[PDB]
């Protein structure tokens, strides 16, 4: 049918060879035939791994450890555990993700009958809680012999430091082997207790449910789980011989996908490392990068990678372009690399520069299958480090990995350390992103991110450049003083 | 009244109006491209409202990456609509008199002003003082203050300085 | 200060792919070295942005 | 002070004169004819859940049982039963 031609196709928009970024263009609206909630955000991460949402936490030491990775997986995406930490630390962070389950306690504190009540108080003072089970040896692999809680402690003066007070195994309510959270709810409703230990058929302690965690149980329909129903976890790795040791520990910890982490991924070092991974761990999925041009992409795709990370110098913290004059504007880079990678079925990750929801929708419309964020997902409850006040506002530290404060643990600084404002929790803010992405797709006329990319490649999705003036007018203007 | 007038919902509503109240004149919108205009003109509208994200209060482009620069939009939509005798309204972005003359020269038959007519004696609500000057409240219809009567903020709430009377 | 410059020049040539400044110019003259213009927006994004208060 | 009604001031004095250490002063209490929703009402207006139950609903009849946050905390908003009580 006749549709009047108005706007540029993505190929015509990028044919003038200006350095366009996300702020230089707009997507033209289409035809709406569906509600915003009907928009499907399902997304390929690699040749084999599919997420229910396009969003990824960056492998940065101020962004992604196990709590961020768990929250990102549960909300629909994935996180990649950073590597500015020991090989054993990183494998322990991966293990925490891969052995998480909702409502169940992860890595429980446990004691022996030979401990003192002073050790129960010490566990309360360092960990913040007191309901600790007691076992015949000392932890998570022996007969449950009883429980001690703060109500077993209360009326002991500090004069008393007796050995474990304990409510004995005969008194306890316990789950038998492995339970759906409904049988746990029915036990903790009818028992009025604060803990439900889970034992074995030979009565080893195997897990615990806290009443507090069970009362906070919710539906996670986009849970982002592997075949054995555990959460997906990624990890970052370098390209030096020391990284062959991490790659083994992260494999033993059960990592699903590796991201090879460099600023310029088209090296002999990275190609060697990709061939090593694909020849030693053929079950493992490898994302190479970062690349900004199609020639870099071609080398890495021949090396056999399963996805590409796209970006160089667009990061909020990056100063790579100012010190080495090398990079590419991020809209152009995403378009070109994704167009090349699509000829081989390889998905790309649009990494860097994201600040708004429009940037996410723009990057997805230009061919990116997923979006990686450091700065947007930073300063949240799940982000590493702890907050600190300055001028009356909660700020969290956010350092780029090539900054002198990151490489402390002649060197040219490629990054900058800084701070972000407090944001909230990933489980409250990722829904805002998902809702804005869905409304943007609805205004564009795409019922899924796959259909969005299919409309862009066939010339149905139209675009429009913006002068400086049009970017000014597309903001907020003319008001005396507005507020958000 | 919508931000994206090229929906099944608006076309249904236009057909309903033209079949129940055939004496009534309907302006559809908002549209920024000629394809949207074509759908609405087939649906039988009597005029078009043109604009998306140029408003003084709007932040639609920053949150959904969708819109068009207003001079281009006015020209293109008005050029298409003129082939059918349909007038368009250049809506949004007006701040000066030159903007009105520019929009009229690009093919708009009328100009819709929100912020430029706000903070007048005739505008709704009541004045307040800040920093020794009279202000009136001015807000987007999809700002969180307006739409309170998870939701995404399409617009902003703010202030405009006192202006006088429409008749002056 | 000059060693800092020499180290940055060497790392920039290494990211570009040139093992010497003579080879760099030879790649530029033969069309192997590729370039890319920048809008105002791309120069803004190529800086430091979005942070509350950074430091060098 | 006396910048208050005579009955308010006598109630402030009566609170002091009937205080005792560790014991609760002016306890919140409910009847078996109240709903679980009245325990939630008493909570977000006072800040506590451990409310005893008696035949007249206050300080002056057989103690018939207690209702508390662990008697409430697995009920959905779908349930607004009359008083879940731990019995005498
Ligand atoms: N994407 C960006 O825009 C960008 C820019 C700068 C830094 N970074 C980040 O900074 C961190 C550090 O990575 P990087 O960028 O410094 O690159 P890198 O750590 O991979 O390499 C740094 C230097 O060591 C060399 N090198 C790497 N592996 C080697 C090997 N096996 N043998 C010999 N030399 C080897 C490289 O060629 C380079 O000169 C990463 O997190 C990276 O993503 C990212
Ligand atoms: N500058 C602009 O053009 C612009 C931008 C944003 C908002 N606005 C204004 O904000 C106000 C709110 O309008 P809006 O933009 O949110 O659009 P809207 O209220 O018409 O529609 C909002 C959402 O509801 C849906 N909807 C509408 N009718 C429906 C129906 N019958 N069944 C199902 N879904 C239906 C739409 O598809 C859309 O997802 C208006 O005053 C509008 O002009 C204007
Ligand atoms: N033994 C434990 N090992 C690890 N985590 C625990 C343990 N006991 C409690 N937690 C966790 O600590 C948090 C608070 O738990 P809970 O409300 O049950 O505190 P508690 O054990 O009763 O301590 P307290 O007496 O101080 O209130 C929950 O997230 C819970 O999962
Ligand atoms: N599963 C259980 N089976 C039997 N007794 C238990 C069980 N869990 C806890 N207890 C015992 O019940 C008593 C209360 O502990 P519980 O965890 O229920 O509350 P608590 O967290 O100590 O109470 P509070 O929140 O007031 O501090 C203690 O004597 C404790 O040892
Ligand atoms: N029924 C009541 N009437 C009046 N005051 C009460 C009552 N129950 C508790 N309080 C007071 O409230 C404060 C907190 O008491 P407590 O720790 O026992 O809370 P609770 O009744 O268990 O409520 P919650 O479930 O929220 O913890 C204490 O100072 C206590 O004296
Ligand atoms: N004096 C009592 N005699 C018998 N049962 C009681 C008594 N006081 C409370 N209970 C019951 O014991 C259970 C736990 O109540 P308790 O006051 O000890 O904890 P809670 O306030 O409900 O929970 P928590 O302290 O963890 O916040 C409830 O089922 C309650 O009805
Ligand atoms: O210190 C640094 N220097 C350069 N690039 C970095 C640094 N740390 C992280 N990056 C890149 O910046 C991306 C995050 O971009 P941001 O979300 O805009 O801040 C990461 O995924 C990396 O590709
Ligand atoms: O909340 C809002 N979000 C988006 N656009 C709005 C909102 N409220 C009003 N508008 C648009 O803004 C136009 C007025 O533009 P203004 O005169 O520049 O302020 C109106 O006619 C509407 O099309």
Short mmCIF file of C-alpha atoms in Angstrom, two decimals, chain C residues 13-45:
data_model
loop_
_atom_site.label_atom_id
_atom_site.label_comp_id
_atom_site.label_asym_id
_atom_site.label_seq_id
_atom_site.Cartn_x
_atom_site.Cartn_y
_atom_site.Cartn_z
CA UNK C 13 50.17 4.64 17.69
CA UNK C 14 49.66 1.14 19.13
CA UNK C 15 45.83 1.59 19.18
CA UNK C 16 46.00 2.94 15.62
CA UNK C 17 48.15 0.01 14.51
CA UNK C 18 51.39 1.76 13.50
CA UNK C 19 54.78 0.39 14.73
CA UNK C 20 56.47 3.73 13.83
CA UNK C 21 55.59 7.34 12.92
CA UNK C 22 56.95 6.67 9.39
CA UNK C 23 54.53 3.72 8.99
CA UNK C 24 51.73 5.88 10.40
CA UNK C 25 52.23 8.49 7.67
CA UNK C 26 52.59 5.71 5.08
CA UNK C 27 49.26 4.23 6.12
CA UNK C 28 47.61 7.64 5.98
CA UNK C 29 48.84 8.38 2.49
CA UNK C 30 47.75 5.04 1.05
CA UNK C 31 44.26 5.11 2.50
CA UNK C 32 44.71 2.38 5.09
CA UNK C 33 44.42 4.80 8.00
CA UNK C 34 40.73 5.67 8.29
CA UNK C 35 39.16 8.71 9.90
CA UNK C 36 35.80 9.90 11.16
CA UNK C 37 34.33 13.35 11.59
CA UNK C 38 32.66 14.50 14.79
CA UNK C 39 29.56 16.58 15.29
CA UNK C 40 29.35 18.85 18.32
CA UNK C 41 27.45 16.06 20.07
CA UNK C 42 30.20 13.54 19.39
CA UNK C 43 32.82 15.88 20.82
CA UNK C 44 30.64 16.30 23.92
CA UNK C 45 30.23 12.54 24.35
#
